[PDB]
Nucleic acid binder design. Structure first.
Lengths: 273, 312, 273, 312
DNA sequence: TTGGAAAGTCCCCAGCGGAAAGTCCC
DNA sequence: AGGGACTTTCCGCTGGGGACTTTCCA
């Protein structure tokens, strides 16, 4: 009798709200929920259908999953965690009212104290091993399901995790997007100056990736040409064929080195001199 | 008679106010003409007097009715929000380098203002002009009432609450007060205080040095309509215009604007617009004009930046 | 078409910074500059304005201008040298981001090998004539401009040197400064005791130079009264007029015999007994 | 019971630690009693036992919890930073001349400290007291575990990194330990080791001799406020003071300090200051006092030097 | 609720010195 | 042996500047 996530939460998109904000945040989306149809976090208990209880807890992103300072708020929640009974006659349970409320780097310690005083530590990470910096732009849901063994006495299953959730406030992980481009056609010898407006990017972890069939180049630009994270001015790289006779469509796009992530491609036409 | 006078006015814009939490020494204030090498030394001067003198500097508001500002003047020779330097017995010209404004927080605006009125009534630093009308009886008499009564604490509590419901934390003024040595030698002789131009916080969205960082094209046909990509420093979509222009023969100016809508204003830092038609679409030779940005709200402009209109 | 230095780089004042120091060294100020003015260490191209490239290199001080172990770091540099593109529609070019980054007497051989492997030898000093000790407290900027003949094909002009730059490190050359003086007034008959704190000087090559109108004397003091290279305790020579009736201002300054160098004057006022 | 006892402590200040690259033999310890005529050296004695014996000398930290020190004891009978001599079968007093202090570089502190704890746990030289509490099981048993296990290499790596974050490179102490022959004859019987007074490297600014070289005025009015220029030996602008003082009748002392700021301390070698007011501004006859230099940090002083306070 | 900011936090880079540490040498 | 001085790290403040957070308003 174990637990498995049927429907993981959406990773990026939703922004955690502070306590001083909306008495209410939002509600965590499934991961296949769309504008048309909305879904939600859903686990599946294998080898058990009957009376029990479930607790959803907030933990840290990486390995030593210490309980996160952030508070899960909404229906049936309290002390930063969610808890309610399991449908005794169903094996699948989705939670449609999960809300993340983030704490301030200031009230950090006070928050950690409440995870302790309230006994919230699903991986029993030690008081000694609890020390360290906490990533406040991400978390994981930790489902601690409690069924009953065949005898009839409560049975706490293994705590399972969900891939990490990310605050739509962390540009180190948001989605790349190109918004404008004052020029999508230059010389095949390259060197053409190009003004590109975009979405918040990080000047040290970004580059214009010109891809082609079997070809691959980058635009030339210095970290200081990344204008306030929303505009890059760079010069086109020379195409594979320097004597081009006929114009050739090429794929141009934003690339964040740290993770190989790529924005949608934007058509660019290399031309004979 | 003996008086006080400003030889050099602070620059009004281009300076950032600094919060406590940001730390110390981020830049001093400035004066006119800030030539390439940094040359401003703002210098007041005592006139029709030459001898020992005390000059104090306080932060006041930019309303119709002068008042103490909750903000603090910090740095060289400053203490309790006031800058106190002495005017040499011979040299009567005072300068004020390394002077920074300390931006108080919104939440601590009342109590900080209340404590500044207290310190100014204790030291007798212009209490009647800045805190309240009927407190002028408290003059710096080598310590004009080193101890405030319980009725004087009630005048300050009422002036504080009343002046905080309307204090522009984004603009402030300097006010110099000179004190000459009386009989005893104690500088209690007050001269008519003189206030300075206004100085606007550069971290105000409506006052950062409006600047045109780069432009993909610095020339254009006289028929205009051409599309230009321009990056810039923080600007407000709805509160900004690109203004083309040129000095005329008669002294007047040809004015033309860029065509673009608030949606064309990319993430506060750039603007895609369309050149305006030049005054004369049929010249035979190119003509140079100027192009700048410009807040509607306060009509402040960026630096005239050259543009060339050519025929077609 | 030749090259000439409109503005020479200041020779003393600026200290070469070690690789360990920061990430970048300040930038070489110009000779002209001071408190009140802007200074550019520029060059002038005579008989050519148009497409061209420029490489600023580091060469030794004395005659066999073998390339210098030290490096030229800052904008547009690499391999210890500056290089970029001349402005095509201008004939005057100043360089305001040149810094000097010395090498350790220990990593000397490895720096020399990088001049060789990167082909950095403007005066092609031979592999054989390359042997010998290098003056690490002095170097020479070596502009190597490359324009094009009236013809069209690249034309390398002649390498032009600037006077040497010295590390404000070794005190045998430093700049002379008087900091404090426990007295700037005394008897005409001289013999007055004066303490004077100053910038590092050598006791065997220093002396107090009292200059006046068509008059000239020196202060009396032992190599031993030179305290830790920072203070001089000396006595005031007697003035030309030993019967002075009224006070007379006179110039007093530090003077290094080995090169006549003199610090900025300090007003001294002789008086009558 | 059989113990160890120091006869002559090393001299606390004045000796210079030398770095590898400085060359060899540059000067012997020095004994606390040592003079330029009668030179002495550290010296210890084995009491309540007479016969062969082994005594070793290790440097240790000067903290609250004694720890091995990265520096190495070099020279006579020294190897691997350890001084080892034998206590003659009848003369139980051992001296240590020509002992030098090798000062490890900053960059080689960790790796050299790791190496020393290992050699100390292999030979069994007080591993428990100096390297780590639960390593005391490695006792010099004719070769107390001549081969360190893998778990022992880890304790070492964890003590090394933990102890290097707070090691004072300008202070060291000697630790003597004595071993007496066992049943087999192998010097394995360990006596309570004993530690010496701390030694301070004479190159360290916070430990170099303080001395007033010259002064442009050794007398002053009792009113004080008079400005004097003082030349000295390397001193730290932030950690130094000028103390004037005179023995009183009751045995106490009148204390007076020069008024000077960290900016008045010229290139670590002079100081422009102003005299303090005397304890009595109305005496009729001059009084001879004393003035000296004093580091705050450790409170050491320059040699009392004569100053004359005349009345006005 | 959702989005977009403005208001309040942080804290890097770059240019200067000044000295400590680490090297050599009279 | 004995101490000065030169060459190679380490640190700290001044001046600004961008960007990350908490709070605020439509």
């Amino acid at each position: 009798a174990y637990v498995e996530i049927i429907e993981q939460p959406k990773q990026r998109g939703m922004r955690f709200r502070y306590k001083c904000e909306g008495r209410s945040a939002g509600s965590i989306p499934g991961e296949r929920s769309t504008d048309t149809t909305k879904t939600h976090p859903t686990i599946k208990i294998n080898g058990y259908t009957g009376p029990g209880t479930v607790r959803i807890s907030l933990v840290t992103k990486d390995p030593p999953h210490r309980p996160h300072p952030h508070e899960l708020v909404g229906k049936d929640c309290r002390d930063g965690y969610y808890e309610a009974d399991l449908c005794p006659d169903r094996s699948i349970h989705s939670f449609q009212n999960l809300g993340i409320q983030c704490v301030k780097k200031r009230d950090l310690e006070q928050a950690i104290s409440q995870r302790i005083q309230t006994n919230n530590n699903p991986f029993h990470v030690p008081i000694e091993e609890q020390r360290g910096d906490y990533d406040l732009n991400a978390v994981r849901l930790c489902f601690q399901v409690t069924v009953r063994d065949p005898a009839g006495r409560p049975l706490l299953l293994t705590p399972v995790l969900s891939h990490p959730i990310f605050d739509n406030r962390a540009p180190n992980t948001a989605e790349l997007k190109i918004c404008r481009v004052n020029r999508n056609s230059g010389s095949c010898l390259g060197g053409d100056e190009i003004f590109l407006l975009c979405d918040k990017v990080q000047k040290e972890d970004i580059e214009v990736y010109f891809t082609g069939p079997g070809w691959e180049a980058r635009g030339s630009f210095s970290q200081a040409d990344v204008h306030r994270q929303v505009a890059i001015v760079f010069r086109t790289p020379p195409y594979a064929d320097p004597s081009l006779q006929a114009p050739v469509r090429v794929s141009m796009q934003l690339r964040r080195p740290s993770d190989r992530e790529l924005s949608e491609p934007m058509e660019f036409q290399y031309l004979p001199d | 008679g003996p008086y006080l006078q400003i030889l050099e006015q602070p620059k009004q814009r281009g300076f950032r106010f600094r919060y406590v939490c940001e730390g110390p020494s981020h830049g001093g204030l400035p004066g006119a003409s800030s030539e390439k090498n940094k040359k401003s030394y703002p210098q007041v001067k005592i006139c029709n007097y030459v001898g020992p003198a005390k000059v104090i500097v306080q932060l006041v508001t930019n309303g119709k009715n002068i008042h103490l500002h909750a903000h603090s003047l910090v740095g060289k020779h400053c203490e309790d929000g006031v800058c106190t330097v002495t005017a040499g017995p011979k040299d009567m010209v005072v300068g004020f380098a390394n002077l920074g404004i300390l931006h108080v927080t919104k939440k601590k605006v009342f109590e900080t203002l209340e404590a500044r009125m207290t310190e100014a009534c204790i030291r007798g630093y212009n209490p009647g002009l800045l805190v309240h009308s009927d407190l002028a009886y408290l003059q710096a008499e080598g310590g004009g009432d080193r101890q405030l009564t319980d009725r004087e604490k009630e005048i300050i509590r009422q002036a504080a609450v009343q002046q905080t419901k309307e204090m522009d934390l984004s603009v402030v003024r300097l006010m110099f007060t000179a004190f000459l040595p009386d009989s005893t030698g104690s500088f209690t002789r007050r001269l008519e205080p003189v206030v300075s131009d206004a100085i606007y916080d550069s971290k105000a969205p409506n006052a950062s040095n409006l600047k045109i960082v780069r432009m993909d094209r610095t020339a254009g046909c006289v028929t205009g309509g051409e599309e230009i990509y321009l990056l810039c420093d923080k600007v407000q979509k709805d509160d900004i215009q690109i203004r083309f222009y040129e000095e005329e023969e008669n002294g007047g100016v040809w004015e033309g604007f860029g065509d673009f809508s608030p949606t064309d204003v990319h993430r506060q830092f750039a603007i895609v617009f369309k050149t305006p038609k030049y005054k004369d679409v049929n010249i035979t030779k190119p003509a140079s004009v100027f192009v700048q940005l410009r807040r509607k709200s306060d009509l402040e402009t960026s630096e005239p930046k050259p543009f060339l209109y050519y025929p077609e």
